[PDB]
Design an enzyme around this catalytic site. Structure first.
Site, short mmCIF file in Angstrom:
data_model
loop_
_atom_site.label_atom_id
_atom_site.label_comp_id
_atom_site.label_asym_id
_atom_site.label_seq_id
_atom_site.Cartn_x
_atom_site.Cartn_y
_atom_site.Cartn_z
N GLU B 38 0.82 -1.19 0.00
CA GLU B 38 0.00 0.00 0.00
C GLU B 38 0.87 1.26 0.00
O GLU B 38 1.75 1.41 0.85
CB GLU B 38 -0.84 -0.08 1.26
CG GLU B 38 -1.59 1.15 1.64
CD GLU B 38 -2.53 0.84 2.78
OE1 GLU B 38 -2.14 0.99 3.96
OE2 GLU B 38 -3.66 0.40 2.49
N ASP B 112 -1.01 -4.80 -3.42
CA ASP B 112 -2.01 -4.24 -2.54
C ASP B 112 -2.89 -3.35 -3.42
O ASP B 112 -2.52 -2.22 -3.75
CB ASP B 112 -1.32 -3.43 -1.45
CG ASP B 112 -2.16 -3.29 -0.18
OD1 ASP B 112 -3.38 -3.10 -0.28
OD2 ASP B 112 -1.58 -3.37 0.92
N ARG B 113 -4.03 -3.89 -3.85
CA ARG B 113 -5.05 -3.19 -4.63
C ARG B 113 -4.79 -3.07 -6.14
O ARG B 113 -3.65 -3.10 -6.60
CB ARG B 113 -5.39 -1.80 -4.06
CG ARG B 113 -5.84 -1.85 -2.60
CD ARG B 113 -6.59 -0.60 -2.20
NE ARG B 113 -7.20 -0.83 -0.89
CZ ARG B 113 -8.38 -1.40 -0.70
NH1 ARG B 113 -9.11 -1.78 -1.75
NH2 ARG B 113 -8.83 -1.59 0.54
N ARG B 170 -7.56 -1.35 13.20
CA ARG B 170 -6.60 -0.95 12.19
C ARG B 170 -6.98 0.31 11.41
O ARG B 170 -6.95 0.32 10.19
CB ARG B 170 -6.32 -2.09 11.22
CG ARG B 170 -7.53 -2.70 10.54
CD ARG B 170 -7.17 -4.06 10.00
NE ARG B 170 -5.90 -4.49 10.59
CZ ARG B 170 -4.74 -4.57 9.93
NH1 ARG B 170 -4.67 -4.28 8.65
NH2 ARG B 170 -3.66 -4.95 10.59
N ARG B 172 -6.26 3.74 9.76
CA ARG B 172 -5.08 4.32 9.14
C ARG B 172 -4.91 5.76 9.62
O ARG B 172 -5.83 6.32 10.21
CB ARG B 172 -5.20 4.20 7.61
CG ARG B 172 -4.67 2.85 7.12
CD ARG B 172 -5.39 2.34 5.89
NE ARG B 172 -4.73 1.17 5.34
CZ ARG B 172 -5.17 -0.08 5.46
NH1 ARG B 172 -6.29 -0.32 6.13
NH2 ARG B 172 -4.50 -1.08 4.91
C1 LIG Z 1 -12.15 6.32 1.49
O1 LIG Z 1 -10.82 6.65 0.99
C2 LIG Z 1 -10.09 5.77 0.25
N1 LIG Z 1 -9.94 6.08 -1.06
C3 LIG Z 1 -9.17 5.19 -1.84
O2 LIG Z 1 -8.97 5.36 -3.04
N2 LIG Z 1 -8.57 4.02 -1.22
C4 LIG Z 1 -7.79 3.17 -2.15
C5 LIG Z 1 -8.75 3.75 0.13
C6 LIG Z 1 -8.17 2.51 0.68
C7 LIG Z 1 -7.20 2.37 1.60
C8 LIG Z 1 -6.47 3.55 2.15
O3 LIG Z 1 -6.86 3.77 3.48
C9 LIG Z 1 -6.36 1.13 1.58
O4 LIG Z 1 -6.96 0.23 2.46
C10 LIG Z 1 -9.51 4.61 0.91
C11 LIG Z 1 -9.75 4.35 2.38
#
Ligand SMILES: COc1nc(=O)n(C)c(C=C(CO)CO)c1C
Ligand SMILES: COc1nc(=O)n(C)c(C=C(CO)CO)c1C
Lengths: 313, 309
Positions: B38, B112-113, B170, B172
């Site tokens: 990530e 990761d993604r 968890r 972030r």
């Molecule tokens: C709601 O905000 C987001 N926008 C995105 O584009 N991703 C990839 C994420 C995903 C994550 C980053 O916190 C990865 O788990 C979130 C949370």
């Protein structure tokens, strides 16, 4: 297989692009040439409300210091996404129909602008104007779709004084001469960048030559006269002085996308009929492609007219 | 030419464990596999300052009535662009190396993604949270990279209560525990899985569009149902063609993805094993050049080093 000719008319606004294109299209039959016009309707209504107005108002407010840089950048970045959508979908639906590069074409498709206007040029100009971050510009660059074979792009040339005069006369736009200078510079850099890449220029090899136009012709430009020069910005640089790899990869993508394009320069410093005939002569040296199916032509034809009917003025 | 296996681990965030990712990084210790983590450093520092914080604060302020839906949408849209940049750059540089469908692979690349997380799923979830316009979502959709051979995407399964538990442990940096967003993102990924099956089984969204107003999933149980949004429709109720074309792109991108479901309701070791189990059905490709393999390795490790936590 029948051949297709795609021509994207691009470059700074206010030069006479739309007029020239309409005049060229008016020469053909009804269905040997089709115009994919400016999606002004998408911009003013369908995609959001008065986007052009929103963009010019936000720059003005930033210039007047009524808003912060951050606040301007979020507005500009979002607006650019909207501005760009019709170009991107058009490219995506056209893509499976385009064969390899290749005698009159069965069909000529003329476009008001290429995706790079909205995913590279206007963003880069806003960056120079202080209203977009260079990180966001490179995020747009990263999203530029793969360059289809036979991508002929026509860019415009016009003396600054005549251009200023033309703009001063003839939406939501405001008379922003700073933006005019920025967008003229960006398209100048663009032309040099294509010539640089087609002459074998490797930005990674020449990066160090940075510190303190025409294509299809001329010698290799200095990297300092190409778009690569814009990304020598402190935001993009690691403590050790080099580009972060993530941004370097975005420049790798920029190089890949632009290097296969066929760029032509049209002189707009003449009457509308003059521009038309000059464009007509220019098309003689443009690159055609095959299509992938027999029924691609009328299919492609319907897509263009559908587009024109719905999003054109 | 040598063979490659790409695996994109995706789905709603917060389903996994720290021992889960550690096993993943442990997996990548070998020469035959690299884990692309990530890009948190991009989100927090390189691309912008604390993007995640920005995202969750904005939704919070909208929820509390402190900013307009319009104000939240411009911030949300801009931030999603920053979030997605590392995936999009990685796809663009990797794509020329990928050949046709292709026994052990010379290299396994675990990400990761996938780009659709940032160009479709999270935008769609924010739309459902009233903080992004559906026009913006389809603008991102229009830019989804062409789906290459061997696009294996792993989506997670976990009951909602268990998901809430894991998510709470968890968060972030800058994240806020939002159950409404949790529901939205879970719905979006469920719809995504159904959408791939719908398309793979022959579903034609244009043919079925009328069913949204009147063997495969029903179209109302796919992503297409989200785009019956009135902003996208003409006064007579028809989708504007520009949006219909974006749905055609969506269909094309999604149909050729290979989806695998990973049950996260188990131990990190179990999750890791289950992931290894799932690989036997994943699609491998050749690469395009002799030097593609070490180049890919370099890309992947450099990404990890620069942008991984
Ligand atoms: C709601 O905000 C987001 N926008 C995105 O584009 N991703 C990839 C994420 C995903 C994550 C980053 O916190 C990865 O788990 C979130 C949370
Ligand atoms: C500065 O704002 C703009 N952003 C864009 O993306 N485009 C394509 C344009 C170009 C035109 C229509 O807005 C005029 O051709 C402008 C002016």
């Amino acid at each position: 297989m029948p051949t297709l000719l795609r021509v994207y008319i691009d470059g700074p606004h206010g030069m006479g692009k739309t007029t020239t294109t309409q005049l060229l299209v008016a020469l053909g039959s009804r269905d040997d040439i089709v115009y994919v016009p400016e999606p002004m309707t998408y911009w003013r209504v369908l995609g959001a409300s008065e986007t052009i107005a929103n963009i010019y108002t936000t720059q003005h407010r930033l210039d007047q210091g009524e808003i912060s840089a951050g606040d301007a950048a979020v507005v500009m970045t979002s607006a650019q996404i909207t501005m760009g959508m019709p170009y991107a979908v058009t490219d995506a639906v056209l893509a499976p129909h385009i064969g390899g590069e290749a005698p009159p074409p069965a069909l000529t498709l003329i476009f008001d602008r290429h995706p790079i206007a909205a995913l590279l040029c206007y963003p880069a100009a806003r960056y120079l104007m202080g209203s977009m971050t260079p990180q966001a510009v490179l995020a747009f660059v990263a999203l530029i779709p793969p360059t289809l074979p036979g991508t002929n792009i026509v860019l415009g040339a016009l003396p600054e004084d005549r251009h200023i005069d033309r703009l001063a006369k003839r939406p939501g736009e405001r008379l922003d001469l700073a933006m005019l200078a920025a967008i003229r510079r960006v398209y100048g850099l663009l032309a040099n960048t294509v010539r640089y890449l087609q002459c074998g220029g490797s930005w990674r090899e020449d990066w160090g030559q940075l510190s303190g136009p025409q294509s299809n012709a001329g010698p290799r430009p200095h990297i300092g006269d190409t778009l690569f020069t814009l990304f020598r910005a402190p935001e993009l640089l690691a403590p050790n002085g080099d580009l972060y790899n993530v941004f370097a990869w975005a420049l790798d993508v920029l190089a890949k996308r632009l290097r296969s394009m066929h760029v032509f320069i049209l002189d707009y410093d003449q009457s509308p009929a003059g521009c038309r005939d000059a464009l007509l002569q220019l098309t003689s040296g443009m690159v055609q492609t095959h299509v992938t199916t027999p029924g691609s032509i009328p299919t492609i034809c319907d897509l263009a007219r559908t587009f024109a009917r719905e999003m054109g003025e």
